[PDB]
Design a protein around this ligand. Structure first.
Ligand SMILES: Nc1nc(=O)c2nc(Sc3ccc(Cl)cc3)n([C@@H]3O[C@@H]4COP(=O)(O)O[C@H]4[C@H]3O)c2[nH]1
Ligand SMILES: [Ca+2]
Length: 151
């Protein structure tokens, strides 16, 4: 349809994302303008632990699992699942680190909205309330990683 109507469809979804509900319009618009879409089928690794990463992901369709290598275990342990409306991949950006867990599609036809580091920094990373929320969440993820003896 129009660019505007496509944008409205993305705006409506992004405003249903709890993380983004309070973001200023101009930064939401920048996410709409800069996002890309990636599709995955069941078992695909969206993120692999021990890889460089500088992109942030919003799950628009489907479910993924979060797994992580830990001490005393040979296979990665299942931390949680994420569903439509949730997000992942901020930690590498905020911690300036390699990817710290695997993100694996649990269903066929998973769809992610992806933005790069500069876009992230200029939107999420620039709106104080959200920046601080994610920085604090990442600090807790560090303590969870320590608790479970992440390798
Ligand atoms: N180290 C680590 N420990 C966890 O206990 C954990 N739980 C999750 S789901 C989650 C998603 C977003 C927020 Cl703010 C909080 C939790 N994640 C996510 O996995 C991704 C791997 O790639 P990355 O770039 O390291 O970002 C990471 C995180 O997004 C975790 N990472
Ligand atoms: Ca456009």
């Amino acid at each position: 349809s129009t660019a505007q109507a496509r944008d409205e469809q993305y705006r409506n979804f992004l405003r249903s994302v709890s993380l983004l509900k309070n973001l200023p319009e101009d930064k939401l618009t920048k996410i709409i303008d800069c996002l890309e879409v990636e599709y995955y089928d069941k078992g695909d690794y969206i993120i692999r632990e021990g890889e460089e990463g500088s992109t942030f992901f919003i799950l628009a369709k489907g479910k993924v699992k979060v797994t992580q290598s830990t001490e005393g275990h040979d296979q990665p342990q299942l931390i949680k699942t994420l569903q439509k409306g949730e997000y992942f991949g901020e930690k590498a950006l905020i911690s300036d680190d390699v990817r710290s867990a695997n993100i694996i599609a649990e269903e066929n036809d998973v769809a992610c909205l992806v933005i790069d580091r500069e876009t992230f920094n200029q939107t999420v990373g620039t709106f104080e309330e959200l920046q601080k929320y994610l920085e604090g969440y990442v600090a807790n993820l560090n303590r969870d990683d320590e608790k479970r003896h992440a390798k």
